Amino acid sequence: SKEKFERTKPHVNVGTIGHVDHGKTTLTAAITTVLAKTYGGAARAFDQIDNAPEEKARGITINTSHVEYDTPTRHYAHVDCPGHADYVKNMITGAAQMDGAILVVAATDGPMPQTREHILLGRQVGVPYIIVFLNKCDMVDDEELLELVEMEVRELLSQYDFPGDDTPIVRGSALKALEGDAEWEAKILELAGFLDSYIPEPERAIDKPFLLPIEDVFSISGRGTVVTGRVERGIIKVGEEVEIVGIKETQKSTCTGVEMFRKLLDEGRAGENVGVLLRGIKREEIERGQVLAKPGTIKPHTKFESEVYILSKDEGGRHTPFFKGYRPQFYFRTTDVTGTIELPEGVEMVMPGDNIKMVVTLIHPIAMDDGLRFAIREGGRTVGAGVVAKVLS
Amino acid sequence: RTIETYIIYLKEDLKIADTCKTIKDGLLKSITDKTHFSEELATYFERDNPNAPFKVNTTDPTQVAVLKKLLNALENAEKSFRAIENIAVMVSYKAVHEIYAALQLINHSNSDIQDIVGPHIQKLLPQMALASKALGNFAPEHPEESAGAVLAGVVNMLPSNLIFELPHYFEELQKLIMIKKANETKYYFEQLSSKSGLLAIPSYLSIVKRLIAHSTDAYLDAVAKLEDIKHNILPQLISELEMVEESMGLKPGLLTDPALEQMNKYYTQLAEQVDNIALGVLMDDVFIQKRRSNQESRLNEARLSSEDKSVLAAANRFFDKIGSYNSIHKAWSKWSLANISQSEKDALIKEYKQFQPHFAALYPDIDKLVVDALTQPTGSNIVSRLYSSDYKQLWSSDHFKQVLSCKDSVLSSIQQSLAQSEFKAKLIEKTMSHSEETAYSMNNKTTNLTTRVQPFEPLKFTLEDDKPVEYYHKRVIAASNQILELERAQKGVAEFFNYIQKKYPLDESDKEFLRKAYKTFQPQLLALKHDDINTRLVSSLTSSRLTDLVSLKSGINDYLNEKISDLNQDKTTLLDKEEEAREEQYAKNPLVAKGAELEKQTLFGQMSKLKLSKSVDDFFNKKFQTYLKDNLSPEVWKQLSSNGETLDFDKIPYLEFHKDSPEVAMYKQLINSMHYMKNGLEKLESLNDYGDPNNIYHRTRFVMTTFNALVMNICFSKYYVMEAGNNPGLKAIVQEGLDLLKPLEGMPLIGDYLKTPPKQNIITAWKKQQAVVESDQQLISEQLGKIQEAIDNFDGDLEVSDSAREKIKTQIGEFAKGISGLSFGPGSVKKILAALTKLETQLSNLDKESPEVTLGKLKDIHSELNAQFRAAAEYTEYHSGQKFGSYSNNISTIVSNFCNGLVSNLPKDTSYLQLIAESLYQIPVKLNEIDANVKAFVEGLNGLSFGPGSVKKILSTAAKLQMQLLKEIQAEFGTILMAAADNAEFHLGLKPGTYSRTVSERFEKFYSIDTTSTQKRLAREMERLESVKEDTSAIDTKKSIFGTEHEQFSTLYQPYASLRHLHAIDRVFEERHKINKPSSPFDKLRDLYLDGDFEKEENKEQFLQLYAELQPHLIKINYQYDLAYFLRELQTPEDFKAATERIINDESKLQELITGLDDTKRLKVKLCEERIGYFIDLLKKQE
RNA sequence: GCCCGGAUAGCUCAGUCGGUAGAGCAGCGUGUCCUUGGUUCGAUUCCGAGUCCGGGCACCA
Ligand SMILES: Nc1nc2c(ncn2[C@@H]2O[C@H](COP(=O)(O)OP(=O)(O)OP(=O)(O)O)[C@@H](O)[C@H]2O)c(=O)[nH]1
Ligand SMILES: [Mg+2]
């Protein structure tokens, strides 16, 4: 818009996940204000994160919010995700832009169903690192309860291939730190240090062909249509031609400006949360789940063989088997598509807790490749987690 | 192919659709009998058309609703399975779990319903388990998921006490009427007081003991005892009997009228005996009074419970308040009931306390959620509460939605409970009317009056204000009973003064009606100052002005009307105070979750709380293996215990069984059965334990399948134990183990659960299996249908009831089943069809001739059909390669039963031991009760073989005894028994002496020089060892499987097998028969595999013959080498090739079997030498 | 992105106490009621998700 976004520090994409009402938005506000006290910062408030009228009315986060803050060594784009089970899809989209996740677990509650669900979904959408912030430690004076919560969270993290015994856990209080209690702002500073150290600087593919999964579409008045998201690979520059691939027929356009947190950029690099302005496309012709690609570099597909683990009842999955013709929703990076399932020869039903090799045919072509992890959701619950073994058509 | 196998398995092996239809028909015919159940219950199950489902209303009783749901589930499952047969996995799964949902309904279903339903639904439990197991292999394979026993032959094991107990007891007491009356009482007490399993009357032992004691015995004490029996004991027994029949729903007097007649006869004879030694009518006045008082108390209980509306109103208020929250207010509360205001929580708790049991019965988990959300303090954190994972899953849900989703079910349950109470009240009314009718009929159909009746006493109430609920409830029920008494008195007044007006608009003729009418309101007329009128009327009506007693009709009517009004007002006051006391006691008690406690009692919770697994494990580890170590010979004990004193628990689930001796294999199978029983019981108890206070238990249909699977395993294992218990040396410990599992036969959802073999040509069996896969018979079926329609269309003067139509339909079905597997000879079909046509013509002309000619013609038809079917069955037996006289007898029996039914509905060594006991007991009685001693001896010595020579010895010794009618005969009998017991011991691995000493002790106890008997036994042992050393079973089986050319054939065949995997290559294949000619079935099978051209039928038949030769040995290697399922899968030539490969791959296991036979001989010689050493030691020590 | 409402024969539609879908027209209906699951003895019917369509809100790199 006005500034130019001088590039000084390495950029990391982090975000808050966890069960509903456990303190993710308060943690984001506290982090930003404490870092603005200690360093430059911007000091965003709670109301500026949850600003939609529906969010204020219901008192919950509904859509993911984006903030930025700078430690001395890093620049962080932070995604605040909803915790309510009804809006898990939105959280998934946020979790698709995360190089790291802060798992907010309330000490007064401990791990909850959405804690496990968010861990699993972030694992499926590519979150490689999790830091636990034990929130609401100003309401739990007991230490045995804190140790029990810590061990439960570590076991839950280890259940999904995260290094539970190595994941840092911060016993803090987002509300007290936001209020101004210095003893509790030290915990936010420790969490920022853990963000700096525990999460390594990601290796970005700035040489591969450009690719950007679309997370949100805006209609900027007087400018046009902007697609926001994290550049998976490559570099997008102003004036370059791009293709919109995915749900509908692939379209062609040109990039007429790249921004990043309302600051002009000459080129958008891999791993950066950027907004790209496209020439001559209406807001209704693009949607979340489509992909911006270099022309002639991505072919959408509908059919693929995959190895899928079906969650058990105790993990929040199905409690009954499903048969051929099951039509659940498949969640790739920012895409959710209805698909039909074909079971392997000799198998007619799949029980909860099973590992199967099935062929999925989606109702719309989407951009995907071998080794791309995905989630399966149906009836408002996660029912499976698989990886694309190979692409058929 | 797999789906076709599943479909054929469902249609022909399980026959699930037919089983469901039969169970539904039997249940519906039993619950609409009208001779066992009252018409009140039967009217609920009347349908305009049989194709419509039963409609479950909120206004029908609870048990009627359960029965309707079960019948609908059975019909739906039958429909789904029949649709499957007409063509699949999803449909079968849905039908199976609908049956399981019905079973879960039965699990929570009020043991009266359980005993009504169990005998019928027990017929498909193994079928459901097998269907679920078959469905399980369409899913991905899960190793160690079940880890249970292999269900080898379960498909072949697929399978009035209450009304007769009391009459039998009172008949026995009738039979009990110096020392003669001193042991009969003991015998009767032992016979009757030991009986149980039907004591739903929760006092039975007290009545039996008190009645026996009183029947064992100035006249004042005897009269007091008689009145105690007549007024306290027998009325209580009758009232409990009526309670049982009312809870069941049976017709009035079904099991109370025969019992009542029996006790009436017993009491009359006892009173006659007492009078002869020195009143007795059993229905004088006060037996009737007490019976009617109890009946009215129960009726008022039911009516009060039915007219209660506080629970339903409280549930409605609770659900309205919970549903009054919109989306905004739910969001403000964070969709949790714990976040609402304290006053709202108090109101919700007040509402919920009144209907918590109904909510918790259906939703044990939502009940806990509601209790924790409403009663916990908000200050306490969730972490300290230590909630479980699934409890936290339920806790995170929208609480308002979860509670609101229970509204329809909870309201339906409450209204159905009210309907159940009203239906029980109607049943009690019918019972009261029938009891009055029987009381009238039993004496003379006449009534007797008395002027010494205590007048009416209208009770008044001076009641406290701070007393518990029962205090006011008792007074309410007393007032209601008095209201009923006054009501019947006023009805009697109306009848009396209507009959008087209608018979004469005191020296009359039909004084019985006036007597019975005045007996109802005599106390009320005596309450007013009318004693003179009462004493002037009783005598006048028992021995002989009617114009003056009609004057005081309005007065007595007004008295009754005002007394009823006062009682009603007092009842309203008492009800108000009782409701206030109920509110106070609800406020005092804190709210506590009830779901787990209710789940602990369903049917499987009761079985789980028995801890049968612990007792089974204790017997297995302490009583079973100790007996095994003590009794088994060391050689046999070595194979079971490598530690010398404990079973090899590292390898308890043995799986080979073909490298062991028959006795060792039997012991290993017994150990496997005990282990599987223990594991299944432990798993069942773990799944049905609800002792975690921090966990929720969701009620669902998808657990019953697991339960059923476990039950199946246990029963399967238990079956083998019984099979292992049919051995002389293993009866005791096996019987003890089964006594431990006794509390399993009796639970409705398990029961017996199981059953508790031809040899035909291999080609014939394969063709039969192929025919049953691909599914004259049509002609005979059409003829039977024509016969059935001719019988149905019979509209002549000889009316045929619909029951007879159903009976002839059942007979025609049985006949069709019997003849469906019958092959007819040339011209036999014509003869049988002509005979059946003549039979159907006769049936169509039943009314056209006299009954004598009809019966003669049908007898001739029966004889002709029986002869023709005998001949056809013999032809089929010859052509199927079976044994003569087996199938023909069954066919003739089917024909005879069919014809007898049609004419009716249209208007052993055990014997040797019994003979031995009879002769030995008649020897002293003829040279100086018996049946009981003989039966006890035979039962205690059941299981002896007696061989073919000892039979002649027994006959000769019995002849000698008969000729002579001293100890020589008894010695011969004893040594015959000892030889049989030695055979039994040697067949098992028992140590020498034990069972033989046991049987000898039993024989000598029943009875009330030794060196010769010991020498005879020693000679028997030496000859047995000599015979064993001559055994050549191993070499014979080796020769039979692969003769003395196997090594050379294998060596010259391996290159050919390699060549199997160009133009001149076939030359060696053609010329192999001049250098590698097979001589044994295994080598012939290898050559056939070399041929590989299984398309032709010649080599298919050759493979069938080779498999027929090899099957008796392969069946020990694996149970799947049977003659039914193995032949069923041989459809395509590729299947034949696969079977040939599978049989070829088992040469190593066949060699292992031969080595195991050699080891069996090696062990048998050691057992024989140990027995001989023991016997020579005993002989040398005895001198 | 968040709500709301619809989808039943070739066309127009009734079916609501949850008990096998029927009226007109068109030329006597395997239309299990858009699809997928769940609850239920039983689902067009109740609950959820999804695919289209319609119109109300939100937002603005
Ligand atoms: N005592 C205490 N309260 C806290 C703390 N952190 C958050 N809260 C309270 O918990 C509530 C949770 O609010 P949010 O932080 O917005 O919840 P969320 O993590 O965003 O979860 P969503 O509603 O799904 O977005 C807030 O109203 C805070 O008042 C804490 O550290 N200590
Ligand atoms: Mg939030």
Author numbering:
A (entry chain C): 2 to 394
B (entry chain A): 3 to 89, 104 to 175, 189 to 206, 228 to 267, 279 to 339, 382 to 608, 617 to 655, 663 to 874, ...
Provide the authors' original text about this structure.
One of these effectors, SidH, 253 kDa in size with no sequence similarity to proteins of known function is toxic when overexpressed in host cells. SidH is regulated by the LP metaeffector LubX which targets SidH for degradation in a temporal manner during LP infection. SidH folds into a large network of helical bundles that does not share a notable similarity to any other protein in the protein data bank (PDB). Interestingly, we found that SidH interacts with bacterial tRNA and EF-Tu as it comes bound to these molecules during the purification.
The structure of SidH is composed of a set of discrete bundles of helices that are intricately arranged with respect to each other, resulting in the overall shape of SidH resembling the letter “I”. Two major regions of SidH located in the central (1041-1240) and the C-terminal (1620-2225) parts could not be built into the EM map due to the poor local resolution (5–8 Å) of the map in these regions. The T-loop situated at the kink of the “L” shaped tRNA molecule inserts itself into the positively charged groove formed at the intersection of Hb1, Hb3 and Hb5 in the N-terminal region of SidH. With regards to specific interactions between SidH and tRNA, Arg819 of SidH interacts with the phosphates of U55, G57 and C56 of the tRNA. EF-Tu that is bound to the tRNA in the structure of SidH has clearly resolved Guanosine triphosphate (GTP) in its active center indicating this ternary complex (EF-Tu/tRNA/GTP) is in principle ready to translocate tRNA onto the A-site of the translating ribosomes. EF-Tu and SidH share a buried surface area of 1184 Å2 where the N-terminal region of SidH mediates interaction with the GTP-binding Domain 1 and the beta-barrel Domain 3 of EF-Tu. SidH W438 engages catalytic His85 of EF-Tu in a cation-pi interaction and also makes hydrophobic contacts with I61 and the aliphatic part of the R59 side chain. At site 2 of the SidH/EF-Tu interaction, the beta-barrel Domain 3 of EF-Tu interacts with Hb1 of SidH mainly through hydrophobic contacts.
